[PDB]
Design a binder for this molecule. Structure first.
Ligand SMILES: C[C@]1(C(=O)O)[C@@H]2CC[C@@H](O2)[C@@]1(C)C(=O)O
Ligand SMILES: [Zn+2]
Ligand SMILES: [Zn+2]
Length: 315
């Protein structure tokens, strides 16, 4: 084995650079190194609140990306366009790192590596795909079994359970993969108190955070997905008012231009998987936010070439 190795059992920037190249070239991280990253990131994640609360000073910025779905080559492209993560270039990836795309193992170990390297500046929130039900069906379990073992997959599942569910920046912008709630009256403190180390329930706020979608019309609707609800602009306004927030950023739906701003400015979607599943033809975006100005700035990008593996090849 001549690939990337941890230094004194820990991730370093030189290791991350070697890993990205190893992966670009379609090579596999030694099972022992993958194991070490999984055990170490589980420890880090298990210490975090369900609601990560981050302060951005007025000179600081942060980049928010939505779903990536195993599109490793597009992930590399985000880092080339926007710079590598660092203490001065923080990232939030908003769920759905795996499944559908056929380089899910490469995406997740790269993201985990950076979480380890910059724990206070590199943020991962759970998506509806960081769950067992979903992985068993949509490729990630298949991909892990092919590249490693069922045992490695079980370890991934355990780590996913520790991913936080939401992140609030400056007490003003709340970020979650899915969206808001099937019931009124949910508070930031309620989110902080969610016992999140589990597979999500079929209902309730942990389910909603991972699964809900905005709708244009006032009210709530039963979701077409068969889980959670669609929520209207009235739901969003009431939630922001109670919680003294300005707006929410969420992901979880493909958008032709990579983003959408709904509810009169209150509910932003960001989606970071361009030409989703080699078929959608959509643009992707990431968002920049600055401490001095938390309004969202959208940066669009398009798909780049990848090796000839079809989406869902391991599904
Ligand atoms: C279909 C998607 C998925 O399966 O995760 C994929 C495409 C849009 C968004 O990401 C989606 C709807 C989601 O629910 O996360
Ligand atoms: Zn998704
Ligand atoms: Zn989703």
């Amino acid at each position: 084995y001549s690939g990337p190795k941890l230094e004194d059992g820990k991730v370093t920037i030189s290791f991350m650079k070697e890993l990205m190249q190893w992966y670009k070239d379609q090579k596999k991280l030694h099972r022992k190194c993958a194991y070490q990253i999984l055990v170490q990131v589980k420890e880090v994640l298990s210490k975090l609140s369900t609601l990560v609360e981050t302060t951005l000073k007025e000179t600081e910025k942060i980049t928010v990306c939505g779903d990536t779905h195993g599109q490793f080559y597009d992930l590399l492209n985000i880092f080339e366009l926007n710079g590598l993560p660092s203490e001065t270039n923080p990232y939030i990836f908003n769920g759905d790192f795996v499944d559908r795309g056929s380089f899910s193992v490469e995406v997740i170990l790269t993201l985990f590596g950076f979480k380890l390297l910059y724990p206070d500046h590199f943020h991962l929130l759970r998506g509806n795909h960081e769950t067992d039900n979903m992985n068993q069906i949509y490729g990630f379990e298949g991909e892990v079994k092919a590249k490693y073992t069922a045992q490695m997959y079980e370890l991934f599942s355990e780590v996913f359970e520790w991913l936080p569910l939401a992140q609030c920046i400056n007490g003003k912008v709340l970020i979650m993969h899915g969206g808001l709630f099937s019931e009124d009256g949910v508070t930031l403190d309620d989110i902080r108190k969610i016992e999140r180390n589990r597979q999500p329930p079929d209902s309730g706020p942990m389910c909603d955070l991972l699964w809900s979608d905005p709708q244009p019309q006032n009210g709530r609707s039963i979701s077409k997905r068969g889980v959670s609800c669609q929520f209207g602009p009235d739901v969003t306004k009431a939630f922001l008012e109670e919680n003294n927030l300005d707006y929410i950023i969420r992901s979880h739906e493909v958008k032709a231009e990579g983003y959408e701003v709904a509810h009169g400015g209150r509910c932003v979607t960001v989606f970071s998987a361009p030409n989703y599943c080699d078929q959608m033809g959509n643009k992707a975006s990431y968002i920049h936010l600055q401490g001095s100005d938390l309004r969202p700035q959208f940066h669009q990008f398009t798909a780049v070439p990848h090796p000839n593996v079809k989406p869902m090849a391991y599904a």
